[PDB]
Amino acid sequence: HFKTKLKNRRSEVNTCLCIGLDPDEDDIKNFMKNEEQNGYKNIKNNMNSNNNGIENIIKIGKEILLTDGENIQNLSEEDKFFYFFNHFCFYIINNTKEYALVYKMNFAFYIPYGSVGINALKNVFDYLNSMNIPTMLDMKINDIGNTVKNYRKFIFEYLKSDSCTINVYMGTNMLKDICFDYEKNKYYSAYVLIKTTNKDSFIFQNELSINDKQAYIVMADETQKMATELKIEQNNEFIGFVVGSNAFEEMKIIRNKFPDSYILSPGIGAQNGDLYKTLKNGYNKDYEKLLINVGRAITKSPDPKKSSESYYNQIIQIFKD
């Protein structure tokens, strides 16, 4: 159960830090060069980490991943990309987990290579689940009820994520078919898009209204009315909100209207979100109820452990103000 898994983890790490794991083509180039230069220092650590996690947990491409850094030339172009891509992923998690409440994997970064990156994504979730670390797939899913049950299967049964992001512009009925499996009486947690970090986000979320009540608040209301119709919390799960760290005014409106709501706040670091106005406006005594996502400021750092420690420390301090 996600509510209790977040509450627990947080007593393990005492933080808000949600780490975004969005690897791109320059990450893998950089990581490859870094490993060439350092004698495969990080990949060597990956061979040993999470109590021998590759050997004992990875089920797709294990033999490739166990290749000695100094036998890479023996692999295909494709197997070579799979190798570094997966290794880059394991390196980030191995180095940043002691500061992470949750990892959020944005699907967009895994699908452009077809089956290569989907295989890696499965490896990633399996690896994280092996350590009971809270997980999220950021995929901003939407479709009709019958069609979305497919995304429920992929996210919640095959990857076995704890949560995902959903766009409910089509409607809230879809939540019934993503966050609830009737046959299994199983509930799955998610976060619904309310205020997004893109610069033109005002265009529909703000300009649209019902009687000067702005779209993003309507959607928040409808989302929770659906979550209560579903009795999702009876099962210690929830449907929460995405409100970007650049939208601190909206953040204040949402936390005040919905004080016990689980919120995810992206856009810190690379997207130039405001950390203090975010945490002040979105504060909750239960820290898991406000996830602060940091992606590229950590994954693109020369030292992701240290970068993650930075944000962790940053947070510990704002709280003490």
The DSSP result for 31-69, as a single string, is HHHHHHHHTSHHHHHHTTHHHHHHHHH--SSHHHHTS-G
Residue 299: C-alpha distances to residues 48, 215, 252 (Å):
21, 34, 29
8 Å CB contact between 292 and 311: yes
Q: What share of the chain is helix, strand, coil (3-state, %, to 5)?
A: 55, 15, 30
301-312 CB burial, b ≥16 within 10 A, e <16? beebbebbbbbb
- CA–CA separation, 197 vs 267, rounded Å? 6
Q: Which residues pair with 190 in a beta bridge?
A: 239
Cα Rg of the chain, angstroms: 20
DSSP 155: I
DSSP 8-state code for residue 276: H
Give me the domain span that covers residue 42.
Answer: 1-321
- Determine the Cα–Cα distance for residues 102 and 155; give it in Å rounded to an integer: 16
Q: Which residue has the tokens 């400021």?
A: 297
Q: How far is CA 188 from CA 47, 100, 318, in A?
A: 33, 21, 32
| CATH number of the domain where residue 149 is located | 3.20.20.70
User: After which residues does a break in the chain occur, C–N more than 2.5 Å?
Assistant: none
Query: CA–CA separation, 204 vs 320, rounded Å?
Result: 36
Distance CA(187)–CA(203), nearest Å, equals 33
Active site members: 140
Q: How far apart are CA 96 and CA 94, in angstroms?
A: 6
Q: Which two tokens stand for residue 89?
A: 């992923």
Joined together, the tokens standing for residue 14 give 């005492």
To one decimal place, what's the resolution in Å? 2.0
CB-based contact 201:187 (threshold 8 Å): no
Q: Could you identify the residue written with the tokens 């452009």?
A: 112
State the total domains in the chain.
Answer: 1
- State the method: X-ray
Residues contacting residue 306 through CB under 8 Å, at least 6 positions apart: none
The residues, any chain, with a CB within 8 Å of residue 275's CB and separated by 6 or more, are 245, 268, 292, 314, 315, 318
Give the whole-angstrom CA distance, residue 259 versus residue 237.
16
Query: What is residue 244's DSSP assignment?
Result: -
- The DSSP 8-state label assigned to residue 181 in this structure reads E
